[PDB]
Short mmCIF file of C-alpha atoms and ligand atoms in Angstrom, two decimals:
data_model
loop_
_atom_site.label_atom_id
_atom_site.label_comp_id
_atom_site.label_asym_id
_atom_site.label_seq_id
_atom_site.Cartn_x
_atom_site.Cartn_y
_atom_site.Cartn_z
CA UNK A 5 -15.95 -53.87 85.08
CA UNK A 6 -13.11 -54.54 87.34
CA UNK A 7 -10.46 -54.48 84.71
CA UNK A 8 -8.07 -51.77 83.61
CA UNK A 9 -8.92 -50.10 80.32
CA UNK A 10 -7.57 -51.44 77.10
CA UNK A 11 -4.37 -49.89 76.43
CA UNK A 12 -2.71 -47.87 75.26
CA UNK A 13 -3.93 -45.41 77.91
CA UNK A 14 -2.98 -41.60 78.06
CA UNK A 15 -4.21 -39.29 80.83
CA UNK A 16 -5.79 -36.07 79.58
CA UNK A 17 -4.43 -32.68 80.74
CA UNK A 18 -6.27 -29.64 82.14
CA UNK A 19 -5.16 -27.59 79.26
CA UNK A 20 -6.35 -30.08 76.77
CA UNK A 21 -10.00 -29.32 75.22
CA UNK A 22 -12.78 -29.19 77.79
CA UNK A 23 -16.35 -29.85 76.70
CA UNK A 24 -17.49 -28.54 80.25
CA UNK A 25 -16.56 -27.74 83.90
CA UNK A 26 -18.23 -29.45 86.88
CA UNK A 27 -19.36 -27.66 90.03
CA UNK A 28 -21.63 -28.31 92.80
CA UNK A 29 -24.85 -26.90 94.52
CA UNK A 30 -24.89 -26.16 97.62
CA UNK A 31 -22.22 -23.63 96.15
CA UNK A 32 -18.64 -23.00 97.09
CA UNK A 33 -17.85 -20.39 94.24
CA UNK A 34 -19.26 -16.99 93.81
CA UNK A 35 -22.25 -16.65 91.20
CA UNK A 36 -19.94 -14.29 89.24
CA UNK A 37 -17.55 -16.99 88.45
CA UNK A 38 -20.54 -19.31 87.22
CA UNK A 39 -21.67 -16.39 85.09
CA UNK A 40 -18.28 -15.97 83.65
CA UNK A 41 -17.83 -19.80 83.00
CA UNK A 42 -21.09 -20.01 81.45
CA UNK A 43 -20.56 -16.99 78.82
CA UNK A 44 -18.23 -19.55 76.90
CA UNK A 45 -18.37 -23.13 78.31
CA UNK A 46 -20.80 -25.72 79.44
CA UNK A 47 -21.16 -25.63 83.08
CA UNK A 48 -22.40 -28.94 84.63
CA UNK A 49 -23.86 -28.33 88.40
CA UNK A 50 -24.16 -31.39 90.47
CA UNK A 51 -27.74 -31.05 92.48
CA UNK A 52 -29.41 -33.48 94.62
CA UNK A 53 -32.91 -33.65 93.08
CA UNK A 54 -35.26 -32.21 90.44
CA UNK A 55 -36.34 -29.29 93.00
CA UNK A 56 -33.04 -28.45 93.80
CA UNK A 57 -32.26 -28.08 89.98
CA UNK A 58 -35.16 -25.82 89.73
CA UNK A 59 -33.78 -23.56 92.82
CA UNK A 60 -30.41 -23.40 90.90
CA UNK A 61 -31.99 -22.42 87.75
CA UNK A 62 -34.03 -19.58 89.57
CA UNK A 63 -30.73 -18.25 90.95
CA UNK A 64 -28.96 -18.25 87.72
CA UNK A 65 -31.87 -16.91 86.01
CA UNK A 66 -31.79 -14.02 88.41
CA UNK A 67 -28.19 -13.37 88.35
CA UNK A 68 -28.16 -13.28 84.12
CA UNK A 69 -26.28 -16.56 83.62
CA UNK A 70 -26.20 -17.85 80.18
CA UNK A 71 -28.60 -20.65 80.68
CA UNK A 72 -27.98 -22.18 77.22
CA UNK A 73 -24.48 -23.42 78.99
CA UNK A 74 -26.19 -24.61 81.98
CA UNK A 75 -26.32 -28.54 82.41
CA UNK A 76 -27.01 -30.68 85.46
CA UNK A 77 -26.39 -33.95 87.10
CA UNK A 78 -28.64 -35.26 89.85
CA UNK A 79 -26.65 -37.35 92.56
CA UNK A 80 -25.98 -37.03 96.09
CA UNK A 81 -22.58 -35.25 97.12
CA UNK A 82 -21.21 -34.57 100.53
CA UNK A 83 -19.18 -31.43 99.11
CA UNK A 84 -18.41 -28.69 96.78
CA UNK A 85 -14.81 -29.94 96.23
CA UNK A 86 -15.32 -31.40 92.78
CA UNK A 87 -11.85 -31.19 91.95
CA UNK A 88 -10.93 -33.76 94.75
CA UNK A 89 -13.54 -36.61 94.10
CA UNK A 90 -14.86 -36.35 90.57
CA UNK A 91 -13.45 -38.77 88.01
CA UNK A 92 -10.26 -38.22 86.01
CA UNK A 93 -10.32 -38.22 82.24
CA UNK A 94 -7.88 -40.70 80.02
CA UNK A 95 -7.84 -41.67 76.49
CA UNK A 96 -7.62 -45.55 75.92
CA UNK A 97 -7.94 -47.84 73.01
CA UNK A 98 -6.72 -45.69 70.50
CA UNK A 99 -9.78 -43.22 70.25
CA UNK A 100 -11.94 -43.50 73.22
CA UNK A 101 -12.31 -41.07 76.27
CA UNK A 102 -12.91 -42.84 79.68
CA UNK A 103 -13.10 -41.88 83.31
CA UNK A 104 -11.22 -43.29 86.25
CA UNK A 105 -12.46 -43.63 89.81
CA UNK A 106 -10.45 -44.03 92.93
CA UNK A 107 -10.76 -44.15 96.52
CA UNK A 108 -11.39 -40.47 97.65
CA UNK A 109 -9.15 -40.05 100.71
CA UNK A 110 -11.88 -38.49 102.86
CA UNK A 111 -14.76 -40.13 104.76
CA UNK A 112 -17.20 -38.72 102.17
CA UNK A 113 -18.99 -41.47 100.86
CA UNK A 114 -21.32 -39.54 98.46
CA UNK A 115 -18.61 -37.84 97.01
CA UNK A 116 -16.50 -41.10 96.72
CA UNK A 117 -19.44 -42.73 94.74
CA UNK A 118 -20.07 -39.77 92.45
CA UNK A 119 -17.89 -40.74 89.38
CA UNK A 120 -20.23 -43.59 88.44
CA UNK A 121 -23.01 -40.97 88.01
CA UNK A 122 -20.39 -38.80 86.08
CA UNK A 123 -19.74 -41.43 83.64
CA UNK A 124 -23.51 -42.35 83.27
CA UNK A 125 -24.35 -38.65 82.43
CA UNK A 126 -21.47 -38.24 79.92
CA UNK A 127 -22.01 -41.67 78.40
CA UNK A 128 -18.37 -43.01 78.89
CA UNK A 129 -16.84 -45.92 80.45
CA UNK A 130 -15.61 -45.88 84.03
CA UNK A 131 -12.46 -47.96 85.22
CA UNK A 132 -11.93 -48.27 89.06
CA UNK A 133 -8.24 -47.73 90.16
CA UNK A 134 -7.77 -48.92 93.63
CA UNK A 135 -5.83 -46.30 95.19
CA UNK A 136 -6.64 -43.76 97.96
CA UNK A 137 -6.39 -40.67 95.73
CA UNK A 138 -7.60 -36.90 95.54
CA UNK A 139 -7.73 -34.52 92.41
CA UNK A 140 -6.25 -31.68 93.99
CA UNK A 141 -3.00 -33.49 94.38
CA UNK A 142 -3.21 -34.65 90.99
CA UNK A 143 -1.80 -33.22 87.64
CA UNK A 144 -0.91 -34.66 84.22
CA UNK A 145 0.98 -33.23 81.46
CA UNK A 146 -0.60 -35.07 78.68
CA UNK A 147 2.59 -37.04 77.75
CA UNK A 148 2.38 -39.64 80.63
CA UNK A 149 3.90 -37.54 83.50
CA UNK A 150 2.17 -36.84 86.33
CA UNK A 151 3.33 -34.96 89.78
CA UNK A 152 1.68 -35.68 93.27
CA UNK A 153 2.69 -34.75 96.84
CA UNK A 154 4.10 -37.53 98.88
CA UNK A 155 0.41 -38.57 100.14
CA UNK A 156 -0.05 -40.43 96.94
CA UNK A 157 2.69 -43.12 98.50
CA UNK A 158 1.83 -42.52 102.34
CA UNK A 159 -2.03 -43.02 102.25
CA UNK A 160 -1.40 -46.00 100.04
CA UNK A 161 1.29 -47.41 102.32
CA UNK A 162 0.13 -51.23 102.07
CA UNK A 163 1.40 -50.81 98.40
CA UNK A 164 4.95 -50.63 97.46
CA UNK A 165 5.82 -47.30 95.54
CA UNK A 166 6.44 -49.56 92.65
CA UNK A 167 2.70 -50.95 93.19
CA UNK A 168 1.32 -47.53 93.13
CA UNK A 169 3.31 -46.46 90.15
CA UNK A 170 2.05 -49.57 88.34
CA UNK A 171 -1.61 -48.50 89.14
CA UNK A 172 -1.14 -45.10 87.58
CA UNK A 173 0.35 -46.85 84.58
CA UNK A 174 -2.66 -49.22 84.08
CA UNK A 175 -5.41 -46.80 84.51
CA UNK A 176 -3.86 -43.57 83.44
CA UNK A 177 -0.84 -44.43 81.29
CA UNK A 178 1.49 -42.59 83.43
CA UNK A 179 5.05 -43.79 82.81
CA UNK A 180 6.55 -41.06 84.76
CA UNK A 181 4.92 -40.76 88.22
CA UNK A 182 6.71 -37.60 89.91
CA UNK A 183 5.78 -38.02 93.52
CA UNK A 184 7.53 -35.32 95.65
CA UNK A 185 7.66 -34.35 99.51
CA UNK A 186 5.13 -31.61 99.55
CA UNK A 187 6.99 -28.01 100.09
CA UNK A 188 4.07 -26.17 101.62
CA UNK A 189 4.13 -27.25 105.43
CA UNK A 190 0.44 -27.23 105.74
CA UNK A 191 -2.05 -30.11 106.64
CA UNK A 192 -3.57 -30.59 102.89
CA UNK A 193 -0.53 -31.86 100.94
CA UNK A 194 -2.07 -30.97 97.50
CA UNK A 195 0.13 -30.04 94.62
CA UNK A 196 -2.55 -27.48 93.49
CA UNK A 197 -1.40 -25.38 96.47
CA UNK A 198 2.06 -25.21 95.11
CA UNK A 199 2.60 -26.06 91.51
CA UNK A 200 0.76 -26.19 88.19
CA UNK A 201 1.52 -27.47 84.81
CA UNK A 202 0.41 -24.64 82.25
CA UNK A 203 1.44 -26.35 79.23
CA UNK A 204 3.75 -29.46 78.55
CA UNK A 205 6.84 -27.22 78.87
CA UNK A 206 5.74 -24.82 81.57
CA UNK A 207 5.14 -25.27 85.10
CA UNK A 208 4.24 -22.48 87.83
CA UNK A 209 5.54 -23.02 91.18
CA UNK A 210 4.45 -20.81 94.39
CA UNK A 211 7.17 -18.36 95.84
CA UNK A 212 7.08 -16.93 99.40
CA UNK A 213 8.95 -14.18 100.92
CA UNK A 214 12.56 -15.02 101.65
CA UNK A 215 11.97 -15.02 105.80
CA UNK A 216 8.94 -17.33 105.33
CA UNK A 217 9.60 -21.14 106.99
CA UNK A 218 8.75 -22.61 103.45
CA UNK A 219 10.85 -20.28 101.31
CA UNK A 220 13.87 -22.75 100.55
CA UNK A 221 11.45 -25.68 100.06
CA UNK A 222 9.76 -23.68 97.36
CA UNK A 223 13.01 -22.41 95.81
CA UNK A 224 14.15 -26.07 95.74
CA UNK A 225 11.00 -27.45 94.06
CA UNK A 226 11.47 -24.52 91.45
CA UNK A 227 15.06 -25.47 90.86
CA UNK A 228 14.14 -29.21 90.45
CA UNK A 229 11.63 -28.32 87.66
CA UNK A 230 14.16 -25.97 86.03
CA UNK A 231 16.62 -28.59 85.96
CA UNK A 232 14.30 -31.17 84.21
CA UNK A 233 13.46 -31.62 80.86
CA UNK A 234 10.09 -31.76 79.64
CA UNK A 235 8.16 -33.87 77.35
CA UNK A 236 8.92 -31.80 74.25
CA UNK A 237 12.63 -31.90 75.12
CA UNK A 238 13.39 -28.56 76.23
CA UNK A 239 13.73 -27.92 80.13
CA UNK A 240 10.63 -26.55 81.88
CA UNK A 241 9.85 -22.96 81.61
CA UNK A 242 9.47 -22.41 85.36
CA UNK A 243 7.00 -19.29 86.46
CA UNK A 244 6.75 -18.14 89.98
CA UNK A 245 3.50 -16.85 91.84
CA UNK A 246 4.55 -14.75 94.76
CA UNK A 247 2.26 -15.17 97.85
CA UNK A 248 3.01 -12.50 100.16
CA UNK A 249 0.08 -13.37 102.45
CA UNK A 250 -0.63 -17.23 101.53
CA UNK A 251 -2.78 -16.33 98.70
CA UNK A 252 -3.86 -19.10 96.67
CA UNK A 253 -2.38 -17.91 93.19
CA UNK A 254 -1.39 -21.38 92.15
CA UNK A 255 -5.13 -22.76 92.57
CA UNK A 256 -6.25 -21.75 89.32
CA UNK A 257 -8.52 -23.38 86.39
CA UNK A 258 -7.30 -23.59 82.91
CA UNK A 259 -10.36 -24.09 80.92
CA UNK A 260 -9.83 -24.20 77.05
CA UNK A 261 -8.43 -20.76 76.36
CA UNK A 262 -9.30 -18.86 79.49
CA UNK A 263 -7.68 -18.97 83.01
CA UNK A 264 -9.23 -18.43 86.16
CA UNK A 265 -7.06 -17.35 89.11
CA UNK A 266 -8.45 -16.72 92.43
CA UNK A 267 -7.52 -13.31 94.06
CA UNK A 268 -7.82 -12.22 97.64
CA UNK A 269 -5.57 -9.10 98.20
CA UNK A 270 -3.67 -6.82 97.92
CA UNK A 271 -4.77 -5.65 94.44
CA UNK A 272 -1.22 -5.00 93.43
CA UNK A 273 0.07 -8.39 94.67
CA UNK A 274 -2.91 -10.16 92.83
CA UNK A 275 -2.32 -8.29 89.71
CA UNK A 276 1.46 -9.22 89.76
CA UNK A 277 0.36 -13.01 89.99
CA UNK A 278 -2.08 -12.52 87.05
CA UNK A 279 0.87 -10.73 85.15
CA UNK A 280 2.88 -13.93 85.47
CA UNK A 281 0.09 -16.00 83.79
CA UNK A 282 -0.10 -13.51 81.00
CA UNK A 283 3.51 -13.69 80.27
CA UNK A 284 3.64 -17.47 80.35
CA UNK A 285 0.22 -17.92 78.46
CA UNK A 286 0.28 -15.73 75.52
CA UNK A 287 -3.19 -16.00 73.72
CA UNK A 288 -5.04 -16.99 76.94
CA UNK A 289 -7.50 -14.89 78.72
CA UNK A 290 -6.24 -14.43 82.33
CA UNK A 291 -9.25 -13.72 84.64
CA UNK A 292 -8.94 -12.62 88.24
CA UNK A 293 -11.74 -13.95 90.35
CA UNK A 294 -12.77 -12.48 93.70
CA UNK A 295 -14.19 -15.20 96.11
CA UNK A 296 -17.58 -15.28 97.66
CA UNK A 297 -18.37 -13.87 101.01
CA UNK A 298 -19.99 -16.88 102.53
CA UNK A 299 -17.33 -19.37 101.17
CA UNK A 300 -14.20 -17.38 100.82
CA UNK A 301 -10.78 -18.53 99.06
CA UNK A 302 -8.39 -19.94 101.60
CA UNK A 303 -4.46 -20.71 100.90
CA UNK A 304 -5.35 -24.41 101.09
CA UNK A 305 -8.62 -24.31 99.14
CA UNK A 306 -9.74 -22.00 96.43
CA UNK A 307 -10.97 -21.95 92.79
CA UNK A 308 -9.01 -25.21 91.32
CA UNK A 309 -10.37 -26.96 94.60
CA UNK A 310 -14.08 -26.20 93.68
CA UNK A 311 -14.08 -27.19 89.92
CA UNK A 312 -13.13 -29.90 87.63
CA UNK A 313 -12.63 -29.76 83.83
CA UNK A 314 -14.73 -32.48 81.78
CA UNK A 315 -13.05 -33.74 78.63
CA UNK A 316 -14.68 -33.94 75.49
CA UNK A 317 -15.92 -37.60 74.75
CA UNK A 318 -15.66 -37.02 70.96
CA UNK A 319 -12.04 -35.43 71.21
CA UNK A 320 -10.14 -34.50 68.11
CA UNK A 321 -6.97 -35.31 69.60
CA UNK A 322 -3.54 -34.40 68.12
CA UNK A 323 -0.16 -36.03 69.25
CA UNK A 324 2.84 -34.10 68.26
CA UNK A 325 6.47 -33.83 69.68
CA UNK A 326 7.85 -30.54 68.19
CA UNK A 327 10.75 -29.56 66.41
CA UNK A 328 12.49 -26.71 68.56
CA UNK A 329 15.57 -24.55 68.75
CA UNK A 330 18.61 -25.25 66.61
CA UNK A 331 18.02 -27.86 64.14
CA UNK A 332 20.40 -29.64 62.04
CA UNK A 333 18.52 -30.51 58.69
CA UNK A 334 19.14 -30.78 56.00
CA UNK A 335 15.16 -32.06 56.61
CA UNK A 336 12.91 -30.47 58.77
CA UNK A 337 10.19 -33.14 59.04
CA UNK A 338 7.26 -32.59 61.72
CA UNK A 339 5.07 -35.72 62.36
CA UNK A 340 1.70 -35.64 64.13
CA UNK A 341 -0.95 -38.30 64.74
CA UNK A 342 -4.62 -37.08 64.38
CA UNK A 343 -7.28 -39.27 65.99
CA UNK A 344 -11.01 -38.63 66.16
CA UNK A 345 -12.78 -39.77 69.18
CA UNK A 346 -16.23 -38.83 67.52
CA UNK A 347 -15.38 -41.44 64.62
CA UNK A 348 -15.55 -38.67 62.44
CA UNK A 349 -13.47 -38.36 59.01
CA UNK A 350 -10.75 -35.97 59.50
CA UNK A 351 -9.98 -33.21 57.23
CA UNK A 352 -8.06 -31.16 56.46
CA UNK A 353 -4.73 -31.49 58.62
CA UNK A 354 -2.55 -28.59 58.01
CA UNK A 355 0.76 -26.77 59.09
CA UNK A 356 0.37 -23.23 59.59
CA UNK A 357 3.74 -21.66 59.23
CA UNK A 358 5.60 -18.32 59.25
CA UNK A 359 9.39 -17.83 58.12
CA UNK A 360 11.37 -15.12 59.65
CA UNK A 361 8.45 -13.22 61.63
CA UNK A 362 6.83 -11.35 58.87
CA UNK A 363 3.41 -11.12 57.31
CA UNK A 364 0.68 -13.90 58.13
CA UNK A 365 0.81 -17.52 58.93
CA UNK A 366 0.56 -19.61 55.53
CA UNK A 367 -1.33 -23.15 55.53
CA UNK A 368 0.23 -26.30 54.05
CA UNK A 369 -1.59 -29.45 53.85
CA UNK A 370 0.23 -32.54 55.76
CA UNK A 371 0.58 -35.94 54.06
CA UNK A 372 -1.28 -38.95 55.41
CA UNK A 373 1.41 -41.54 55.23
CA UNK A 374 -0.79 -44.36 56.90
CA UNK A 375 -4.15 -44.28 58.87
CA UNK A 376 -4.00 -41.29 61.24
CA UNK A 377 -0.33 -40.52 60.89
CA UNK A 378 0.62 -37.28 59.22
CA UNK A 379 3.75 -35.55 58.15
CA UNK A 380 5.20 -32.45 56.58
CA UNK A 381 8.57 -31.21 55.55
CA UNK A 382 9.68 -27.37 55.66
CA UNK A 383 11.34 -26.80 52.16
CA UNK A 384 13.41 -24.00 50.76
CA UNK A 385 14.81 -23.06 53.95
CA UNK A 386 18.15 -21.37 54.25
CA UNK A 387 21.04 -21.43 57.05
CA UNK A 388 19.59 -19.24 60.30
CA UNK A 389 15.90 -18.91 58.84
CA UNK A 390 13.39 -18.94 61.80
CA UNK A 391 10.45 -20.94 61.75
CA UNK A 392 7.32 -20.38 63.70
CA UNK A 393 4.59 -23.27 63.45
CA UNK A 394 1.33 -25.10 64.68
CA UNK A 395 -0.62 -27.95 63.48
CA UNK A 396 -4.43 -27.58 62.73
CA UNK A 397 -6.91 -30.28 62.18
CA UNK A 398 -10.79 -30.49 61.74
CA UNK A 399 -13.44 -33.24 61.24
CA UNK A 400 -16.85 -33.41 59.98
CA UNK A 401 -18.31 -33.59 63.33
CA UNK A 402 -17.79 -29.91 63.54
CA UNK A 403 -14.50 -30.19 65.69
CA UNK A 404 -11.35 -27.78 65.03
CA UNK A 405 -8.25 -28.20 66.82
CA UNK A 406 -4.84 -26.88 66.96
CA UNK A 407 -1.48 -28.28 68.36
CA UNK A 408 -0.56 -26.17 70.79
CA UNK A 409 -4.07 -25.94 71.96
CA UNK A 410 -4.06 -21.94 71.76
CA UNK A 411 -2.70 -21.98 68.23
CA UNK A 412 -1.37 -18.89 66.49
CA UNK A 413 -0.32 -16.87 69.50
CA UNK A 414 2.18 -19.34 70.90
CA UNK A 415 3.81 -21.31 67.86
CA UNK A 416 6.46 -23.92 68.13
CA UNK A 417 9.74 -22.30 67.26
CA UNK A 418 12.81 -23.41 65.58
CA UNK A 419 15.84 -22.43 63.69
CA UNK A 420 17.35 -23.89 60.51
CA UNK A 421 21.12 -24.88 60.85
CA UNK A 422 21.70 -26.83 57.66
CA UNK A 423 24.45 -28.88 59.17
N1 LIG B 514 -7.95 -29.24 95.63
C1 LIG B 514 -8.22 -28.47 96.77
N2 LIG B 514 -8.80 -28.86 97.85
C2 LIG B 514 -9.32 -28.41 99.08
C3 LIG B 514 -9.88 -29.46 99.95
C4 LIG B 514 -10.38 -28.89 101.03
C5 LIG B 514 -11.13 -29.53 102.27
N3 LIG B 514 -11.49 -28.83 103.47
C6 LIG B 514 -10.44 -30.89 102.61
O1 LIG B 514 -9.49 -30.79 103.00
O2 LIG B 514 -10.80 -31.83 102.16
NA1 LIG B 515 -14.30 -42.56 94.10
#
């Protein structure tokens, strides 16, 4: 149809559950990456024909790829930049997952048309957002914020900024459309070359040497996010990836509990970048990925550019705003909504918690107050007690999710003040 999705709408972040990752043949990524992806996750390869599918299967077989995780879509494409032209994922109508198409900002008509084939393959509805856009220049936090470089306005110059913002609201549920002047001084003007939400409360911002012409622009961008309150109510934790030689360290893919970071030398500088991700993202497996010789990583074009995560059409979605830091009390009540996009019965919904840092986390059932709305109150806590917690839900489709996504390795933390 030509109508927007039935509300409310919520754009899905890259660090939410992914059912698959989308790549394209002829390839722009190394076979070793496809192999590593397929070890744990479904890889959907776009090919132009049944014969081309079989050519790819032969290559996957010869390279030892886990074929049980290899799926295919037959559709014409112009390029391997699946980040930039494939559809964007949003929840809509309470418990549905949909795809949002847009006008691809390149003269690549098969790439531009592709989202319809993606939606057909996935068995989900598609909605047409009439803005000139590109996925590389888009990221959302999963709480209604999105960051883009200035081309989101300048390539839609027949519309006012308000009209552009309204399109993002109507099709993606974006209420905070954070469009900024690109700090990189290069042609592409994509956020994924300088910035990446790692979680709702964490953002990675590129850093360069002091004498690099973009040094101050990037420091200013880091300061901007550090001063900004995030969706959870704390200031963003701002992490920095130092590019000594224009290495594309922010151009990584978060796929479930793994992070794939392009590396292109020197080894020590690559390892420093990987260390930043490891520090920022406890519990995640951080994986450095060397480029393919024929289609190497570039400063403006690397791993994030040549992949796109695919949301779970049956997503078990946990909506939660955490209790953090010094809390007054005397009640410490957490609330979460849990929705099954699989239309499955949800049970159990639990709070896992630990008090004052020792022993194992303990499970307590949350109380369902109304349909899909769960609460839990921490009892018996004394002044200055430290609480770690996370939420866990399961349904009878076999889905199991925590909030935060990674669960126990990175729990929410608060302190009981009793004041
Ligand atoms: N995201 C990432 N994007 C890289 C796209 C590179 C391609 N040469 C273009 O400019 O269209
Ligand atoms: Na399109």
